[PDB]
Amino acid sequence: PVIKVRENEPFDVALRRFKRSCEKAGVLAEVRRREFYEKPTTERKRAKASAVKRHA
């Protein structure tokens, strides 16, 4: 998520863009995911569970 402010665009709008670029890019989610070791069995467990919830 690289951003370049355009002319006569307020610092705020550019910022809001930037934060949404990272929301889009999944940075913090990604960093959260890797802060700590997850066992393979555990991430397979996570994967099934979300497949399941993704039925409405």
Q: What does the binding site for other proteins look like in residue numbers (CB under 8 A)?
A: 1-5, 11, 14-15, 18-19, 21-22, 25, 27-28, 30-32, 34-38
Among 37, 39, 53, 56, interactor with RNA by CB under 7 A:
37
Among 4, 24, 55, 56, interactor with RNA by CB under 7 A:
55
Q: How far apart are CA 39 and CA 20, in angstroms?
A: 31
Q: What is the DSSP string of 5-27?
A: PPTT--HHHHHHHHHHHHHHHTH
Q: How far apart are CA 41 and CA 22, in angstroms?
A: 29
Q: How far is the CB of 48 from other proteins (least distance, A)?
A: 20
